[PDB]
C-alpha cells in the first residue's frame, strides 16, 4: 500500500437543536472534498477553500486525526499520508463542518483499507469525535437521519450512537441564510 489514493466527498448537514432526546439532521448539497494519497512517508497536509491559511497543517488537523483513527479501526497502517482538503462548507456556521471533516477522514481511511468498516461503525467512530451523532450521522448516511445516544455499557458510560435514515420527498428544498 504505497501510491494508493482515495477521494472523499462529504455533505454538510443541518440539525434543529432542541430539548428532545432524538435529533434530526439533514444532509445538504454543500460539500467538502478530501484527497488522500499514501506517500513514501511523513505527513503532508494542504487545506484550500474554507479554513485556508486559518488552520495548522499537520497531525493536529481534524481530518488527519480522523484518518488515523479510521486506519486503526480498519486495523491498518500507512507509511505516510498526503492529505489535501478543498472545503466549501462554511465553518462555525451550524452547517456541520467539523462533523463532515471527521466523517471524511474515517471514510477516507476505510477506502484506503478496502472498506472493512460497516456504516454503523463509521457513524459510531465519527460521532465520537464530537461526542454526538447529530451532524455526523447525516453526513455518513445522507438524506434525513434521526439519531440518539444510548448510555449503555458495563463499563459505563460508553455512549452508543444510533442513527436511522428517513426518505425525504423529492421536492423539498433547503435555503441557508449564512451570516458573515
Amino acid at each position: 500500500n504505497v501510491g494508493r489514493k482515495v477521494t472523499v466527498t462529504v455533505p454538510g448537514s443541518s440539525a434543529n437543536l432542541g430539548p428532545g432526546f432524538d435529533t434530526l439532521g439533514l444532509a445538504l448539497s454543500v460539500y467538502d472534498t478530501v484527497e488522500v494519497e499514501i506517500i513514501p512517508s511523513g505527513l503532508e497536509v494542504e487545506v484550500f477553500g474554507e479554513g485556508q491559511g486559518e488552520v495548522p497543517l499537520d497531525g493536529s488537523h481534524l481530518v488527519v486525526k480522523a484518518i488515523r483513527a479510521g486506519l486503526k479501526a480498519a486495523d491498518a497502517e500507512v507509511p505516510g499520508l498526503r492529505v489535501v482538503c478543498h472545503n466549501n462548507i462554511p465553518q462555525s456556521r451550524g452547517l456541520g463542518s467539523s462533523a463532515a471533516a471527521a466523517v471524511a477522514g474515517v471514510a477516507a481511511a476505510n477506502g484506503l483499507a478496502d472498506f472493512p468498516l460497516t456504516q454503523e461503525q463509521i457513524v459510531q467512530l465519527s460521532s465520537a469525535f464530537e461526542g454526538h451523532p447529530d451532524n455526523a450521522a447525516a453526513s455518513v448516511l445522507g438524506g434525513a437521519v434521526v439519531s440518539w445516544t444510548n448510555l449503555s455499557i458495563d463499563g459505563k458510560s460508553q455512549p452508543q450512537y444510533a442513527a436511522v435514515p428517513l426518505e425525504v420527498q423529492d421536492n423539498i428544498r433547503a435555503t441557508a441564510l449564512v451570516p458573515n
Partner: protein, 62 residues
C-alpha cells in the same frame, strides 16, 4: 437563539429554524424563497445558499 432572521421569516410563513449552533437560519420549502427576501438579507451581509438534500458520503478510489 432566537435569531432575528428566523422569526421574521416565520412571521411571514417560511419554515425557518436556527441551524445547529447558528447563527445560520435554515428555511425548508417546496417553493423557492422570493428573491426580494433573499436580496434584502444579502445586503445586510448574509450569504444565501440554495441547497438540496444530499446523498451519503462518497468515496472513490483513484
Amino acid at each position: 437563539l432566537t435569531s432575528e432572521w428566523v422569526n421574521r421569516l416565520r412571521n411571514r410563513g417560511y419554515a425557518a429554524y436556527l441551524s445547529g449552533a447558528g447563527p445560520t437560519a435554515m428555511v425548508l420549502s417546496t417553493e423557492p424563497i422570493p428573491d426580494k427576501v433573499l436580496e434584502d438579507a444579502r445586503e445586510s451581509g448574509i450569504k444565501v445558499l440554495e441547497l438540496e438534500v444530499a446523498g451519503p458520503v462518497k468515496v472513490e478510489v483513484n
